[PDB]
Amino acid sequence: GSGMSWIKEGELSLWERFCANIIKAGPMPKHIAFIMDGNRRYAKKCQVERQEGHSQGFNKLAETLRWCLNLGILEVTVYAFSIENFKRSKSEVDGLMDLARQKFSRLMEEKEKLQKHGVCIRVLGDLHLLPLDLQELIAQAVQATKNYNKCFLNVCFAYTSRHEISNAVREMAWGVEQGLLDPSDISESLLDKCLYTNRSPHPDILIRTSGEVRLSDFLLWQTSHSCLVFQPVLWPEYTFWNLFEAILQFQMNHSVLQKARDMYAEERKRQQLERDQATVTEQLLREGLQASGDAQLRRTRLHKLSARREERVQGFLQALELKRADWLA
Amino acid sequence: GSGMSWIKEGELSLWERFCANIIKAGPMPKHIAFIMDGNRRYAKKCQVERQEGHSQGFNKLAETLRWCLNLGILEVTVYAFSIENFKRSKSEVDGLMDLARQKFSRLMEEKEKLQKHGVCIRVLGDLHLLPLDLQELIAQAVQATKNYNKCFLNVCFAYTSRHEISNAVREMAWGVEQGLLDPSDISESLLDKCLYTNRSPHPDILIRTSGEVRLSDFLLWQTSHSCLVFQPVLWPEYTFWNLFEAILQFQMNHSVLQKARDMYAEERKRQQLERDQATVTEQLLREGLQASGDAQLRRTRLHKLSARREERVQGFLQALELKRADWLA
Amino acid sequence: AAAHHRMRWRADGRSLEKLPVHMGLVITEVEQEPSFSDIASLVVWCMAVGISYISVYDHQGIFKRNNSRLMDEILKQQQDKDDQVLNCHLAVKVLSPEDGKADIVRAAQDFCQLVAQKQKRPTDLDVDTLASLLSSNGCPDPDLVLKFGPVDSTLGFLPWHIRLTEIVSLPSHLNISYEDFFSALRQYAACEQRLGK
Amino acid sequence: AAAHHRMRWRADGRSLEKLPVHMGLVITEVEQEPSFSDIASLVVWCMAVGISYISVYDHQGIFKRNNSRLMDEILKQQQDKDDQVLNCHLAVKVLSPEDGKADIVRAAQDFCQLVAQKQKRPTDLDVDTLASLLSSNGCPDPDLVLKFGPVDSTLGFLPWHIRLTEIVSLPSHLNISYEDFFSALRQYAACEQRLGK
Ligand SMILES: CC(C)=CCC/C(C)=C/CC/C(C)=C/COP(=O)(O)OP(=O)(O)O
Ligand SMILES: CC(C)=CCC/C(C)=C/CC/C(C)=C/COP(=O)(O)OP(=O)(O)O
Ligand SMILES: [Mg+2]
Ligand SMILES: [Mg+2]
């Protein structure tokens, strides 16, 4: 299939291929998230116009996505346009919208090539803030590449994490209002499935280029246990070796980060069990029943409490997925 | 040390020794309890006087205790005189008291021989109902053979199980009254340590001779999970092979009985944990605190609840042991 | 014919030298789930021949966790429905291990709490008063236990209450016949309790 | 001399281009138990140079389960005692993972319950109102997080609140010097937040 424009690439060189085989003997990330920062500074550095920096920045995204595929990293998430970026000048915002119109739209025309390689394109954000035509181009690309499995690019556009989290709560609130949810069903696990990223596992790595050491409202919930890598390089100058260094950072953190991630999950489940047992106890000392009977009343009520919750959640998620799939464009 | 009168014995014959080695390859009982029944019917069968039946019955106890030792069964408990037996005729009750005076008292004179073989003699019952002189002979024998380890004979005399259980509760009630116990500390485990038999593990086997198929107020608490063996033989006619048959019955029951015993104990501990968690929950929703905190407040309070209980129990048991050891005679 | 069956069972119970006021059914068999229709038959047979109370027991609490299925089966085999239900509830108790030792402990806790509240003295607790606290307060102790299955153990069945209980053992309850049940009653009727004498 | 030390720390904080109103201390080191005297020094340094709020955090909840030992150590290093205690309680928060995601969940439960009680509509929940429910309601978000130890992760520290927080990393807190702490402040003071522009 040669190369798409979102985009294709050549194989790894000898040294890149060698180092890849070495680090592939240890834990590898399944999902990397990039804050693509420093385009404008790069334009000023190369005496090019700001629009040229952003367009070069898109080229680097296509190149970096090829490196990830050549490393067997099949899911990538990128911060392409923040809601805060709407505060930039009309000339720059229009330049970014026109780029997105041009790179999308080229996604079509390159259809079939996306279907040949199973490339799923997801675009995450408060997309009602984008120009209507850009929304329709986005929707077509997302609708066309759905049901594709081989790899996954999540383009965060008109996105912030706080807007994403509050939307996830709104979705759960709608569930309660619709009768699909009880307020007690709300959970960290359920909130996770209400995020824009709910078809993706949390990133193993979060990379931010240029010298900035902050998250800038990107995947705050998703990266709470992710390896964080801040590299001074400007995004349009990103190399395979910057990516390699980041993966190396992840491998050195992996054992601690895994154990902490696992200890956090076990502690949350432990406290959730304690909470459910206390609920069952309260309902039982209300009324006249007891908690330590041979009848195992507590245990039957605990199983029904959790089964009804899971049944209500599965119904809500299915309705949420039906609402999310429902789209003119 | 040849033979004591409570009493000594010869080694096993060839066939007895052979069968012993066979069954010793499987689970063996550590403690057997006997209801020595049928002495009077045996006297009528042999055209001897009732007192001769009871005296022969004592001889069989000494013989049976030798068989148990030759089999490596080092703890035996026997029902020698029930409180209900006080309802028998003065002539028969006196005959039994005189026998006990004679077999005790012969325990002394045979001192040192008991100390040479580490024979611990315990006498369990509401002994204040016995003649004062018999009480003093009993007390001397019990006091002399305390601190002996090699084997253990528990003679239940003026005993019933209901009197034993209610005394155990009285002891725990005294603990509460003395400030050594809280009412919530009372437990199946604690009640066990307040029984007359609290220095003995529960019997593996309960044997009752003659054709009677009832417990007659003997070790009701202790034998709830014991193998029960009812043999038609009259007690003075007991043979090694009746004992062997009973051990065989125990080995056939052992796997089921063990699992049931183990399942009961795990279920009791499970329900005790559920109860303690519910207590901690109630104390926590009283006041304003919560149950699922990172501070692990519930877990700290659960550990303190159980540690203070265990501390109070250990103090009560030590005081109970000091009261029990305190004896003029 | 219904009146004929009733008369036969009444004549059967009345013919024995004695009948248990309270009978216990102890099910030790764990290889197969207990057969509720067979247990219900036994219970109906007891009621039909004149026994006042029947306690159904298994060490795993299976009967206690399937109480409604057992009552329904018992009511079915008897054939106002409210009156029959009330009668079965007054005669039948479905027990499990907690009804033995764990309930003696509960009574001792209640008594010790009265000592703590200065309402009672430790010397107040005697055998009679312990039985008064025992959750079986108004009911007679079991006269007869029918034990089913291959386990030679009461497996925690009402330890306090079986001090004088006759224990008859049957190999299985799985297809129990009325003749097998009545044979046990005949055995109980032939027992002589000398009560220590 | 006490007034001299105070003046120096005030001059130090006042000399920087900017000072964090709210600083977070994230301790990732798990090989050794955290050193309470070193944490207390950092906290006292923040207060001395003019920082309003300090949040102390570790993923294991060690600080939250040893809150009193940490306050006592903080109060000790400062040297009415009631006034100093009240001041430390107003400035210092001891956090653990439950203060992040688990508290966002708590706010969402509270809001959904209001929807259930017909008091609010799902569309009422926006970013501002979510922050109002967030248990950090009256407090500013952390301007600066000092991360100690070798883990390149915030390990669940206040995800909602660190959207703009500058994250400076130090290798260890174990024998932390005032110069090392002030170097971090100088780094934070040199940061430029363009807020999307
Ligand atoms: C889907 C699509 C076509 C996306 C466009 C491609 C792309 C790389 C967009 C990112 C634009 C952006 C805000 C870069 C941030 O660096 P910056 O502008 O803040 O540079 P600076 O920090 O040096 O000022
Ligand atoms: C410590 C000591 C010296 C004890 C005495 C020895 C001994 C064997 C006592 C048991 C006496 C007794 C009540 C036997 C019961 O059979 P039974 O009298 O009821 O006979 P029956 O059932 O045929 O009427
Ligand atoms: Mg930038
Ligand atoms: Mg007898």
Side-chain angles (χ1 to χ4, degrees), chain A residues 1 3 5-6 10-29 31-47 49-105 107-110 114-115 117-131 133-135 137-145 147-149 151-258 260-268 271-274 276-281 284-285 287-291 293-295 297-299 302-303 305-307 309-313 315-317 319-327 329, chain B residues 1 3 5-6 10-29 31-47 49-105 107-110 114-115 117-131 133-135 137-145 147-149 151-258 260-268 271-274 276-281 284-285 287-291 293-295 297-299 302-303 305-307 309-313 315-317 319-327 329, chain C residues 1-6 9 11-16 18-29 34-78 82-83 85-117 119-135 137-178 180-191 194-196, chain D residues 1-6 9 11-16 18-29 34-78 82-83 85-117 119-135 137-178 180-191 194-196:
Chain A
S5 98
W6 259 78
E11 321 304 316
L12 304 180
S13 75
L14 165 57
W15 280 113
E16 303 169 349
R17 171 162 82 250
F18 182 52
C19 296
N21 293 330
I22 290 170
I23 63 152
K24 281 163 106 200
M28 286 297 280
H31 181 190
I32 296 181
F34 295 89
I35 297 181
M36 309 178 288
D37 198 6
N39 291 355
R40 295 185 298 190
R41 275 164 279 176
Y42 165 85
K44 183 178 179 277
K45 199 156 95 162
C46 299
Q47 282 144 210
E49 242 175 291
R50 247 159 198 200
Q51 187 63 7
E52 177 66 13
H54 287 318
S55 165
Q56 275 330 307
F58 176 84
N59 293 346
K60 198 47 78 163
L61 163 52
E63 195 175 11
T64 304
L65 171 62
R66 179 86 256 157
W67 290 325
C68 291
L69 298 164
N70 286 347
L71 294 163
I73 305 163
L74 307 192
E75 176 133 27
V76 170
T77 301
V78 302
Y79 206 179
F81 191 88
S82 163
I83 294 178
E84 312 291 353
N85 293 151
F86 284 125
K87 274 131 64 181
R88 283 176 191 201
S89 88
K90 177 215 209 285
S91 173
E92 183 178 356
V93 168
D94 291 357
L96 285 155
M97 301 300 155
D98 284 333
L99 190 62
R101 288 183 181 100
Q102 185 218 338
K103 293 318 163 172
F104 298 102
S105 147
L107 261 192
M108 324 317 259
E109 305 170 0
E110 281 147 45
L114 303 171
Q115 197 221 76
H117 291 45
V119 181
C120 180
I121 302 265
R122 303 196 271 251
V123 187
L124 316 171
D126 289 46
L127 305 182
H128 55 283
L129 313 169
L130 293 163
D133 62 310
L134 185 45
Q135 287 174 64
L137 282 156
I138 280 177
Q140 279 143 49
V142 164
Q143 182 70 52
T145 64
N147 306 330
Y148 297 179
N149 281 130
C151 58
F152 300 93
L153 173 76
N154 305 284
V155 179
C156 285
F157 215 101
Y159 168 99
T160 73
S161 171
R162 289 187 159 192
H163 274 85
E164 169 180 51
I165 291 171
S166 41
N167 185 75
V169 179
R170 283 201 298 275
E171 305 273 37
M172 296 186 296
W174 168 82
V176 168
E177 162 185 86
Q178 290 309 113
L180 302 160
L181 268 48
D182 284 358
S184 88
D185 294 339
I186 279 67
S187 81
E188 170 170 346
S189 173
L190 183 58
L191 198 155
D192 218 300
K193 310 172 156 96
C194 292
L195 301 172
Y196 300 148
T197 67
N198 66 353
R199 296 189 139 111
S200 313
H202 291 165
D204 296 284
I205 318 180
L206 186 271
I207 301 165
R208 170 154 199 178
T209 54
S210 67
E212 303 313 307
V213 288
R214 63 184 173 277
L215 301 178
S216 278
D217 218 337
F218 187 60
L219 306 181
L220 299 172
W221 177 283
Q222 293 93 331
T223 65
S224 72
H225 288 95
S226 301
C227 186
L228 307 184
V229 183
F230 304 103
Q231 303 174 296
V233 58
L234 302 177
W235 169 251
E237 287 173 334
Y238 213 67
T239 68
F240 174 87
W241 299 112
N242 306 119
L243 176 62
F244 186 77
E245 167 170 77
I247 301 179
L248 220 65
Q249 206 63 36
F250 155 89
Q251 293 196 328
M252 307 193 265
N253 274 276
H254 169 86
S255 68
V256 186
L257 265 195
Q258 188 183 252
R261 221 176 302 201
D262 295 356
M263 281 174 56
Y264 171 94
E266 212 185 70
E267 178 61 23
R268 295 319 301 176
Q271 296 185 10
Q272 185 60 245
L273 175 59
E274 283 164 352
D276 295 333
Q277 299 274 31
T279 301
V280 174
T281 295
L284 276 189
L285 258 64
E287 322 145 357
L289 323 178
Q290 297 235 321
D294 275 358
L297 205 49
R298 148 183 307 287
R299 299 162 203 191
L302 186 67
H303 167 91
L305 169 141
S306 148
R309 173 163 67 209
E310 182 226 299
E311 166 180 298
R312 283 194 305 278
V313 159
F316 159 77
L317 291 178
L320 182 54
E321 193 42 48
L322 264 55
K323 177 170 71 146
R324 292 223 164 139
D326 209 58
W327 266 127
Chain B
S5 98
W6 259 78
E11 321 304 316
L12 304 180
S13 75
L14 165 57
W15 280 113
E16 303 169 349
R17 171 162 82 250
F18 182 52
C19 296
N21 293 330
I22 290 170
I23 63 152
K24 281 163 106 200
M28 286 297 280
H31 181 190
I32 296 181
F34 295 89
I35 297 181
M36 309 178 288
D37 198 6
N39 291 355
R40 295 185 298 190
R41 275 164 279 176
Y42 165 85
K44 183 178 179 277
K45 199 156 95 162
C46 299
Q47 282 144 210
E49 242 175 291
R50 247 159 198 200
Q51 187 63 7
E52 177 66 13
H54 287 318
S55 165
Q56 275 330 307
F58 176 84
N59 293 346
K60 198 47 78 163
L61 163 52
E63 195 175 11
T64 304
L65 171 62
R66 179 86 256 157
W67 290 325
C68 291
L69 298 164
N70 286 347
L71 294 163
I73 305 163
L74 307 192
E75 176 133 27
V76 170
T77 301
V78 302
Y79 206 179
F81 191 88
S82 163
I83 294 178
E84 312 291 353
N85 293 151
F86 284 125
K87 274 131 64 181
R88 283 176 191 201
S89 88
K90 177 215 209 285
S91 173
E92 183 178 356
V93 168
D94 291 357
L96 285 155
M97 301 300 155
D98 284 333
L99 190 62
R101 288 183 181 100
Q102 185 218 338
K103 293 318 163 172
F104 298 102
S105 147
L107 261 192
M108 324 317 259
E109 305 170 0
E110 281 147 45
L114 303 171
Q115 197 221 76
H117 291 45
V119 181
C120 180
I121 302 265
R122 303 196 271 251
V123 187
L124 316 171
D126 289 46
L127 305 182
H128 55 283
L129 313 169
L130 293 163
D133 62 310
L134 185 45
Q135 287 174 64
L137 282 156
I138 280 177
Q140 279 143 49
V142 164
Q143 182 70 52
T145 64
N147 306 330
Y148 297 179
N149 281 130
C151 58
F152 300 93
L153 173 76
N154 305 284
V155 179
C156 285
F157 215 101
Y159 168 99
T160 73
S161 171
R162 289 187 159 192
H163 274 85
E164 169 180 51
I165 291 171
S166 41
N167 185 75
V169 179
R170 283 201 298 275
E171 305 273 37
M172 296 186 296
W174 168 82
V176 168
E177 162 185 86
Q178 290 309 113
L180 302 160
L181 268 48
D182 284 358
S184 88
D185 294 339
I186 279 67
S187 81
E188 170 170 346
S189 173
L190 183 58
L191 198 155
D192 218 300
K193 310 172 156 96
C194 292
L195 301 172
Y196 300 148
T197 67
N198 66 353
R199 296 189 139 111
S200 313
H202 291 165
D204 296 284
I205 318 180
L206 186 271
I207 301 165
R208 170 154 199 178
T209 54
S210 67
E212 303 313 307
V213 288
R214 63 184 173 277
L215 301 178
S216 278
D217 218 337
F218 187 60
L219 306 181
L220 299 172
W221 177 283
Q222 293 93 331
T223 65
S224 72
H225 288 95
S226 301
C227 186
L228 307 184
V229 183
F230 304 103
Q231 303 174 296
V233 58
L234 302 177
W235 169 251
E237 287 173 334
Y238 213 67
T239 68
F240 174 87
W241 299 112
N242 306 119
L243 176 62
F244 186 77
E245 167 170 77
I247 301 179
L248 220 65
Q249 206 63 36
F250 155 89
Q251 293 196 328
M252 307 193 265
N253 274 276
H254 169 86
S255 68
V256 186
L257 265 195
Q258 188 183 252
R261 221 176 302 201
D262 295 356
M263 281 174 56
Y264 171 94
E266 212 185 70
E267 178 61 23
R268 295 319 301 176
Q271 296 185 10
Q272 185 60 245
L273 175 59
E274 283 164 352
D276 295 333
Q277 299 274 31
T279 301
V280 174
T281 295
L284 276 189
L285 258 64
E287 322 145 357
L289 323 178
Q290 297 235 321
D294 275 358
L297 205 49
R298 148 183 307 287
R299 299 162 203 191
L302 186 67
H303 167 91
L305 169 141
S306 148
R309 173 163 67 209
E310 182 226 299
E311 166 180 298
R312 283 194 305 278
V313 159
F316 159 77
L317 291 178
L320 182 54
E321 193 42 48
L322 264 55
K323 177 170 71 146
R324 292 223 164 139
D326 209 58
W327 266 127
Chain C
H4 212 249
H5 279 270
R6 275 192 296 293
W9 279 317
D12 278 2
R14 176 86 42 87
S15 70
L16 297 167
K18 60 157 163 287
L19 248 200
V21 164
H22 182 185
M23 200 207 260
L25 308 172
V26 171
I27 312 308
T28 74
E29 334 190 37
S35 157
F36 277 51
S37 58
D38 288 289
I39 301 308
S41 288
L42 288 164
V43 168
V44 170
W45 291 335
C46 299
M47 307 196 271
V49 301
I51 294 162
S52 270
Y53 306 98
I54 313 96
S55 295
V56 185
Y57 179 90
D58 78 279
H59 184 272
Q60 273 157 284
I62 295 176
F63 289 125
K64 183 167 289 188
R65 294 181 269 111
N66 298 270
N67 173 270
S68 289
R69 206 150 61 70
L70 180 50
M71 281 315 147
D72 290 359
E73 189 63 44
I74 287 173
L75 303 155
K76 168 148 88 95
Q77 301 240 319
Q78 285 200 296
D82 277 6
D83 194 56
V85 166
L86 174 52
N87 285 343
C88 288
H89 290 190
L90 298 155
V92 181
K93 306 137 182 184
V94 179
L95 309 179
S96 64
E98 87 197 330
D99 296 298
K101 285 191 185 173
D103 177 73
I104 299 171
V105 168
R106 195 268 321 150
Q109 283 167 348
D110 287 4
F111 178 74
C112 289
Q113 177 79 16
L114 293 177
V115 186
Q117 280 154 178
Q119 302 207 33
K120 252 102 191 184
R121 202 144 80 264
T123 75
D124 295 326
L125 195 288
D126 66 3
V127 158
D128 292 328
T129 313
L130 191 39
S132 73
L133 303 198
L134 259 204
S135 200
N137 174 54
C139 204
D141 293 334
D143 302 291
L144 172 60
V145 157
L146 255 51
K147 194 168 56 64
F148 295 91
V151 189
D152 299 296
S153 177
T154 51
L155 292 171
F157 175 86
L158 302 189
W160 169 280
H161 305 83
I162 61 176
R163 56 142 176 161
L164 295 165
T165 308
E166 299 291 338
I167 301 177
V168 172
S169 288
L170 295 190
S172 165
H173 73 284
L174 267 200
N175 278 292
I176 199 62
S177 66
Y178 177 71
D180 274 11
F181 163 80
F182 197 75
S183 278
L185 291 192
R186 274 190 287 252
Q187 206 199 121
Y188 170 71
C191 280
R194 306 194 51 109
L195 300 163
Chain D
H4 212 249
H5 279 270
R6 275 192 296 293
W9 279 317
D12 278 2
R14 176 86 42 87
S15 70
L16 297 167
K18 60 157 163 287
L19 248 200
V21 164
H22 182 185
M23 200 207 260
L25 308 172
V26 171
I27 312 308
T28 74
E29 334 190 37
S35 157
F36 277 51
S37 58
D38 288 289
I39 301 308
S41 288
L42 288 164
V43 168
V44 170
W45 291 335
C46 299
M47 307 196 271
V49 301
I51 294 162
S52 270
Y53 306 98
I54 313 96
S55 295
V56 185
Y57 179 90
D58 78 279
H59 184 272
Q60 273 157 284
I62 295 176
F63 289 125
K64 183 167 289 188
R65 294 181 269 111
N66 298 270
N67 173 270
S68 289
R69 206 150 61 70
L70 180 50
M71 281 315 147
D72 290 359
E73 189 63 44
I74 287 173
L75 303 155
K76 168 148 88 95
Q77 301 240 319
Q78 285 200 296
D82 277 6
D83 194 56
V85 166
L86 174 52
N87 285 343
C88 288
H89 290 190
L90 298 155
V92 181
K93 306 137 182 184
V94 179
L95 309 179
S96 64
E98 87 197 330
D99 296 298
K101 285 191 185 173
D103 177 73
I104 299 171
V105 168
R106 195 268 321 150
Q109 283 167 348
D110 287 4
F111 178 74
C112 289
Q113 177 79 16
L114 293 177
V115 186
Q117 280 154 178
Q119 302 207 33
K120 252 102 191 184
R121 202 144 80 264
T123 75
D124 295 326
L125 195 288
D126 66 3
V127 158
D128 292 328
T129 313
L130 191 39
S132 73
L133 303 198
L134 259 204
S135 200
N137 174 54
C139 204
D141 293 334
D143 302 291
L144 172 60
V145 157
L146 255 51
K147 194 168 56 64
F148 295 91
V151 189
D152 299 296
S153 177
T154 51
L155 292 171
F157 175 86
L158 302 189
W160 169 280
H161 305 83
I162 61 176
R163 56 142 176 161
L164 296 165
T165 308
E166 299 291 338
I167 301 177
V168 172
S169 288
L170 295 190
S172 165
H173 73 284
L174 267 200
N175 278 292
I176 199 62
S177 66
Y178 177 71
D180 274 11
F181 163 80
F182 197 75
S183 278
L185 291 192
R186 274 190 287 252
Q187 206 199 121
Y188 170 71
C191 280
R194 306 194 51 109
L195 300 163

